[PDB]
Scaffold this active site. Structure first.
Site, PDB file in Angstrom:
ATOM      1  N   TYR A  14      36.258  44.829  38.482  1.00  5.83           N
ATOM      2  CA  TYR A  14      37.206  45.612  37.703  1.00  5.83           C
ATOM      3  C   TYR A  14      37.973  44.692  36.753  1.00  5.83           C
ATOM      4  O   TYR A  14      38.010  44.934  35.541  1.00  5.83           O
ATOM      5  CB  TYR A  14      38.168  46.312  38.671  1.00  5.83           C
ATOM      6  N   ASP A  38      47.747  56.324  37.011  1.00  3.46           N
ATOM      7  CA  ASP A  38      48.155  55.046  36.497  1.00  3.46           C
ATOM      8  C   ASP A  38      49.013  55.222  35.261  1.00  3.46           C
ATOM      9  O   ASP A  38      48.490  55.555  34.200  1.00  3.46           O
ATOM     10  CB  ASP A  38      46.917  54.228  36.165  1.00  3.46           C
ATOM     11  N   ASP A  99      48.033  47.569  42.471  1.00  2.00           N
ATOM     12  CA  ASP A  99      47.115  48.669  42.432  1.00  2.00           C
ATOM     13  C   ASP A  99      46.536  48.878  43.810  1.00  2.00           C
ATOM     14  O   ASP A  99      46.501  47.965  44.619  1.00  2.00           O
ATOM     15  CB  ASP A  99      45.997  48.378  41.438  1.00  2.00           C
TER      16      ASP A  99
END
Lengths: 124, 124
Positions: A14, A38, A99
């Site tokens: 990612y 997000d 995250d």
């Protein structure tokens, strides 16, 4: 169950595809029915289409991203600290979120949530 | 909504209370219908007494707890990177988790989830 090895690789992939501006790279990591919230508190982005589309926008300027600490991973979930740096109209910004991915049976991310607030947005 | 500052101060107190072996102080931060899932994937501890029992079992040994990075807080949730260290019979352990708090309207923590696995732990 997912292996921590696999979750940690997805998180590293990612970060690397964001650095390369590799949209496909980023989209392939998610489940067809995945959701992305997000930042935390904002309206969720649901399904391949919306998510890609979100990522295209976020890729409209060049990003520099780095994992700032070990990935944490256990029970089908993963969390990580990192930063995203960019420049617009001569002004440099550094965002520091945390995250959290949740992974389905097939090893794809079905849920992503990005926690960071105004105090985690810094100057260059 | 909670302010980021309130939640960042709560995290700060959560950490000071663990260091001080202040059991009452940790539990006070919690909604009395709060849950705590430490570590992610175990069965949750639901409500104050269960939660209090969890924390009393943690404090059986002395803990050194420190934030390793800026706290992240936005819309009623917060997340933070930190180390917890302890020693038992001359053997030192270092756990590096990422916790996540959600809060209620009253400023109380309604859920904590502590995400770490064996790769985030060192015994030696």
């Amino acid at each position: 169950m997912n292996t921590p090895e696999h979750m940690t690789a997805v998180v590293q992939r990612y970060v690397a595809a964001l650095n390369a501006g590799d949209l496909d790279g980023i989209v392939a990591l998610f489940a067809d029915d995945a959701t992305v919230e997000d930042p935390v508190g904002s309206e969720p982005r649901s399904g391949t289409a919306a998510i890609r589309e979100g990522y295209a926008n976020s890729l409209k300027l060049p990003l520099a991203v780095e994992l700032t600490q070990e990935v944490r991973a256990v029970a089908n979930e993963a969390a990580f600290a990192f930063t995203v740096s960019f420049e617009y109209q001569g002004r440099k910004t550094v965002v520091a979120p945390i995250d959290h991915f949740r992974f389905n049976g097939a090893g794809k991310v079905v849920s992503m949530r990005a926690l960071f607030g105004e105090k985690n947005i810094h100057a260059g």
